[PDB]
Amino acid sequence: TVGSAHNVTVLGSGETTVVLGHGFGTDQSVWKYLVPHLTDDYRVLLYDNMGAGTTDPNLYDFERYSSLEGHSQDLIAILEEFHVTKCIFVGHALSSMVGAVSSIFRPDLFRKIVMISACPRVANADDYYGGFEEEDVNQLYGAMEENFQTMMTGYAPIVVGGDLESEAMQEFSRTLFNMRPDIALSICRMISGYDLRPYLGLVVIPCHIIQSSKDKLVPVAVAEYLHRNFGGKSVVELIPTEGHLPHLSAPDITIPVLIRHINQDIAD
Ligand SMILES: CC1=C[C@H](OC[C@@H]2C(=O)O[C@@H]3c4ccccc4C[C@H]23)OC1=O
């Protein structure tokens, strides 16, 4: 019963399956503007990450999900029970990295990864600009732990971006507050604590790096970092738009970019 655990939804028709993973704060409905454009040529599988508001909180193994590997094996188990191989993995934020790690362990399950707002490490290092100094992110988490609803009412507009009181601004706010707070904090400890830079050379399946030109959470430098350190074919396309969830806040300009990168491969 894994399909129930992650609310796996399956539809469309085709020879190769497109898998859709979401990021923190939302769930699979994040892809409302993408699903209809694929179902005429592909099977489409959607799944929620464990911890999302639509999942049973009794299933959030805190020890297992204390690291990205826990979610990576969830994705492998999902793909296995639905008989998915050589899939096209389209992942936003978290799921993109979960997908990338999974493709290292089980390259038989992935043909390519299309990723949006991907981040291999939240904080700045030497040789790496990820947005915020580690010292300061630690305060952003610690204050979120001290006063959860207050500072996430803050956080949510900064992440969605754009005009206040929009569909994406109200949708993300709704799904974000549907998470149980202790689960949300564990997920945040996991994300703010991971560092995938040494893993990137082990990802050798082709990676399409798509990201916003004005994302508070992922600077443009992060995409050129990914493009330079991935172990296989890769490519970068910027989207002239603001926000962390372009696929939801600006579908007219983001969806055709995703489609082209889903449809088309990478030339030598
Ligand atoms: C899955 C995903 C990753 C990327 O966020 C990372 C994180 C998030 O947004 O606040 C989380 C948080 C919590 C405390 C400190 C920093 C961060 C940044 C974290 O954006 C996403 O959707």
Ligand SMILES: [Cl-]
């Ligand atoms: Cl536990």
Ligand SMILES: [Cl-]
């Ligand atoms: Cl186009």
